[PDB]
Nucleic acid binder design. Sequence first.
RNA 1: GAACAGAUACUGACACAGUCCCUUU
RNA 2: GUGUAGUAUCUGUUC
Lengths: 1168, 105, 71, 149
Amino acid sequence: MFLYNLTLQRATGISFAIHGNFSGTKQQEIVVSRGKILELLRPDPNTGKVHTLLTVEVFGVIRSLMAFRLTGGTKDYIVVGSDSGRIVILEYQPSKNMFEKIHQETFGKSGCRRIVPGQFLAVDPKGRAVMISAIEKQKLVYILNRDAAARLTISSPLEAHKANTLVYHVVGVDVGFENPMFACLEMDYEEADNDPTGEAAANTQQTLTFYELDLGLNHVVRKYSEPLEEHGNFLITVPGGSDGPSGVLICSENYITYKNFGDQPDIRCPIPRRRNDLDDPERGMIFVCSATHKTKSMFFFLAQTEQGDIFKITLETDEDMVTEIRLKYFDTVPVAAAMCVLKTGFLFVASEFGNHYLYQIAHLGDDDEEPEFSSAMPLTFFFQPRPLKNLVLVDELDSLSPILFCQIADLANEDTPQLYVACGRGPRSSLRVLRHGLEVSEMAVSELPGNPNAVWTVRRHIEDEFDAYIIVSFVNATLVLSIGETVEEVTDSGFLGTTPTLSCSLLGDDALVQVYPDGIRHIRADKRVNEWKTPGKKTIVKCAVNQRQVVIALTGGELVYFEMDPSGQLNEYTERKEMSADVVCMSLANVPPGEQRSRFLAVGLVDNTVRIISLDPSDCLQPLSMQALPAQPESLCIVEMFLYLNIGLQNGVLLRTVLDPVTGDLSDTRTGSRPVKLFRVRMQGQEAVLAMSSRSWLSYSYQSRFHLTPLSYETLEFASGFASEQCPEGIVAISTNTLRILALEKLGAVFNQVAFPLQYTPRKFVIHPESNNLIIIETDHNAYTEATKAQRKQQMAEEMVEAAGELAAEMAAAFLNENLPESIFGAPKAGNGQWASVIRVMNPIQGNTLDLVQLEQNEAAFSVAVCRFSNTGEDWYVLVGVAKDLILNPRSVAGGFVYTYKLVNNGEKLEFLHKTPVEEVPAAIAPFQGRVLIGVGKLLRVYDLGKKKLLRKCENKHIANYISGIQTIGHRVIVSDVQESFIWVRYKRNENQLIIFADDTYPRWVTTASLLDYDTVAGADKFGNICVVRLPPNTNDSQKAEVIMNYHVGETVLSLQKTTLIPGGSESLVYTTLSGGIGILVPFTSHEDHDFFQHVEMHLRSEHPPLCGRDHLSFRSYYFPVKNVIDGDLCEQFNSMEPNKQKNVSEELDRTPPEVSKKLEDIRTRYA
Amino acid sequence: AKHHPDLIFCRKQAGVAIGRLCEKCDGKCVICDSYVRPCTLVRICDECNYGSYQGRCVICGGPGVSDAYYCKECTIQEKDRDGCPKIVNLGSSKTDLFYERKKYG
Amino acid sequence: QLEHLQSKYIGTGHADTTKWEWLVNQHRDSYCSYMGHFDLLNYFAIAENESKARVRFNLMEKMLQPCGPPA
Amino acid sequence: EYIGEMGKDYIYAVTPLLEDALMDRDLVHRQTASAVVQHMSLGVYGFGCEDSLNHLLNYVWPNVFETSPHVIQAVMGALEGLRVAIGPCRMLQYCLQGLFHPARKVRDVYWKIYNSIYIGSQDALIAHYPRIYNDDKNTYIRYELDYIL
RNA sequence: GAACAGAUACUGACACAGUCCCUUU
RNA sequence: GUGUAGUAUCUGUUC
Ligand SMILES: [Zn+2]
Ligand SMILES: [Zn+2]
Ligand SMILES: [Zn+2]
């Protein structure tokens, strides 16, 4: 009854992004903070493909992240303020590739508390002090003075606690080498609670005060007090001193204000508005983010609005005063929460939801044709948006973070359960499909009938970036080509290819070696023929080619050793080896960079025995050690990254062995019933191996990481590589009677995705048994129906015509001539209680719509479920819940309706049948035994199909809150409450009554639920808690339930399902979260493994503390204590630990680190 | 500490100084007065460490020869996340004992 | 006499604490917890078709006088 | 106290002794039993032994109406030790009933217990807070947690 | 059960010889 | 053996 925690995918949601030179060099790098994962990534100007560098889990909630550098240094130090009661300063070591703790100071309790600092982090631009502030009543200031040891030190915190105050935003102000100054949106509320007349919120504005930091007397006191007239949200830093005047900006509703201390009066400027917005005119406009490109020539401030429009604010100021603020229109981008401009024109935009793009500035936009705006123009501003011209898209990042629903099923003709995920929000919503493998790129297809056997590439020079010869050989046909971007058949080859080819390598610079079953052939550019025929009728089996050594193998084990001298002529040793079996595979070690010859050697035999032979002439071709294998080996090879060896056999096993004459570890997984042959491939300019099976497997080594992932294609026999300029990475594979070219643009390590756009945000979808179609419904808040949009546009055009603009108004037709696309320009919509509803049918094989259903303005679709009725025939009916005038923030609804369809033509047509009135909106649809259950508010109705409308038979009123989900099993039914955990309901048959016999004690905000067995319910929580409730086996049919499991993932979970991922696996509990991460729960098999893992976790909890100083046990036991759950992330962190600590823990556990790693990886191999 | 209800801690923001313990207060927890599993270190506010107060026992104010630690129970209860544990009260028992010694020699 | 721990904290109740102050403190703490968490705010962002900034602004100028006017 | 995390197996044998001790016979026995419960709960923290610890609370709770400082301190320490091991929901439910009692001393002791549980682990309390219906004037309902997707 | 006055027990791993941590016109 | 707090249990007189 003990489970194990495992992770499959990593969170992709981006919340913070800070740019700087974290490595100390002149190449900019980006630090991105996930919900609980810290990741470091950098771009590459030459290619543009962004590659992740570091990814470490912090085991906590990060609320802020800033970077700073000392006055004189060249390294950027990362300061992270998390939910804990301590502040941690981080550093990056390129050699160690790990974050190193530097300083740690505690200032209060842990967790997200109102008065505990950690929300707002203020850093002086020069890097002389750091200020951390809380939401209420608490502020702290630190002085980061440096010592003579070229390091940094931290002093005692200062006191700046103001009584009963609220803080909106804190940012530093440049002063220019005098005492640092901090600005914040101070606000008071003492008089609010002292007014019983209900006149507190009104005429109560906020202020902006400056906090001084006197280094002499070492105290902080209030200095200024500047009340405002509007309600700002956040401030903007402005460079001061030499470049520009020191000051801050005041972003507000439809206004931006520049403020400074001294003789600088306040200046306001209206915010420009788009031409004929499709929103509510009374709706306000605010800013979301900004940027600062502090170029030595001049500095400009970027901005972004709610609609997603980028401006360009230029400060036209005098030496001491300011004249006016000039604005400009730049481009339009999807809504983002944090963006940062980089050097060399690189621009990074981190979208709130969906994919993240990296734009490159091609045009600087210096005094564009479109007119600008300024505060010197009296009286609103209008501008016409244009398509993207200044910026061009070069690279994009795939991130299916907003997961709302998950389903696992097999729809195609294959035998692998496909993964369907509905994600996206608004016009960017899409239904992605996740499948294990790698992306396949198709460039050209050539159909050449035959039976190819092998193909090799030989280059005329040792360091050529392009191929020279392609040995297209068949069983009884030979062909050689050459690439010149117009690949044809070469004429001056003269290789004399009649028998099938068995060897094509490069022993020198332009040397070709060919092997045929009647001798040995040597091909050279000059007229040098070192060809010797095999005596008798014996046929050579194979040869061991390498960079400088060639070893041939013959029947009977009479191997002949050949070594190439610098002169060129081959030589033979005076000794021979004899064995009592045959030879099928040979292994030759790679030549060392300096040494001409190696020492390690491996020989495979039919007798399932492999031996190691020393290559020294003293004991050449002699048996050194003995090693046995289960099956007959097929081929052997050695790869680097510090080298690793893999053993191939006749069956689907790939053992992992280190370079050692003695036998190593036995690590094999599923790889059907096909032999495995090793072959070197190209992977991001590294050394890797390739394996063949029923499905091709590709193995790479990224930072010493091994993952045997397959390829998303059909069965393949042989493959090769291809390197060029336009295609730096590519794979050439030969298929049945045809040749294919493959490339891997994206990494595509796991869970490749495909984009199928939708209209609105998906809610739920089901799968038909025989039709095999997805019935997807959508619902959005503050949305406009297409008919309503057309009517409003017609009304606007009529008003424009009636405006009588000299009668001679051509703008009315121009506006209606072209409509802005919703997917590129956003969806401009506004309202308070406007909804939408779309019902669509999609084919899993091809993403094309089938039927379109639209409803009225105040119609909202919530639940959909196909059902059948016993009283009718084989007609499939679809019921969709519909609301009427539903408003979110206040609870007030009028009624709802229930739709009924017919599913004409087995899922490719639908038709409306009838409706029925319900007092409250239905919650969910649960069909069982030809009966459908309807949940109307707190009631529970029983509905059966009628003639003209639904008819009510039985009702129950015992649920004390709103019902937000119903799950039915073959015998009983379970109802999911909104505040209570669960309510067990039994439906009597003889008397037709609904009764309750089981309920929980601890209220839980349950969102989704599932059933694992006949008496086990795997409930979830809105906050993120996961619990399993099982009824006691001695209950009748009060009887309170019990909890047997508790866990806290820290992310909201909205989907639960217990299925099997890989074929031939075991039942696992896979779950997905709104953040984007996907994890599984694995039950243990033996008690020995359980206690070993428990001891490992207990040792690692106190031996390997988290980076941000968060109590891992307390973090996991956030709301409820953890029960019978083992965290797998801490165990998996074993690999990246220091060698000394690994040795210490291995000695403590009386185990070897290889054994610990193998034991840890056994679970992952078994359950993935 | 707990045995004397007349003693009140400083209860102020901690700084960078390290508390110290004397010979007879070697392996005693500062708050709960335990003898098992010292885990973390004790931090004291700046004003409690100045001039003649440098290197003094937190309980009795004797010469500092040992460091001050926290037990695992205090860490689990999160009672170490508070002000400095320095005792500002002079102690009625010590003064009474000193006066009794003075009267009887 | 040992009660200074409960006197140097914000939101601590006492003998004559009525319902209104307790409820308004509870609402303030709930709003602060909403602001602190990331996925708990992402849930609200997905639920209603606004952005993070608008939700944060609504929460910021909803902390002043919640649960209605005092009495 | 000395055993630490290995005391989870030896809880069954001490339950009858604790059952005998918690009875209102003498103050010293009650104080010693409360200390035993606190030490055991602190020791077994993090192992999910709530099933055995829940029964002891039913008899620990009625030991709060006393005027002796020693037993009051012992009971408060026992409750604080049990809070980290059982979860604040049980103590919140126990305190909610007597929080607004018409009397005075019971209100004071319940408010003291509520303050003690509120000071520590305050974050893990919003989910366990109950729902209170509002009047026509003020609003006491948090509709943001009623959102449905 | 409010008090002006006496006697007997129990609890807090409570403390017990510190000589010096001293100080201006 | 001595001192520093708290608590409990038995008595002179009086409501
Ligand atoms: Zn102090
Ligand atoms: Zn001491
Ligand atoms: Zn302690």
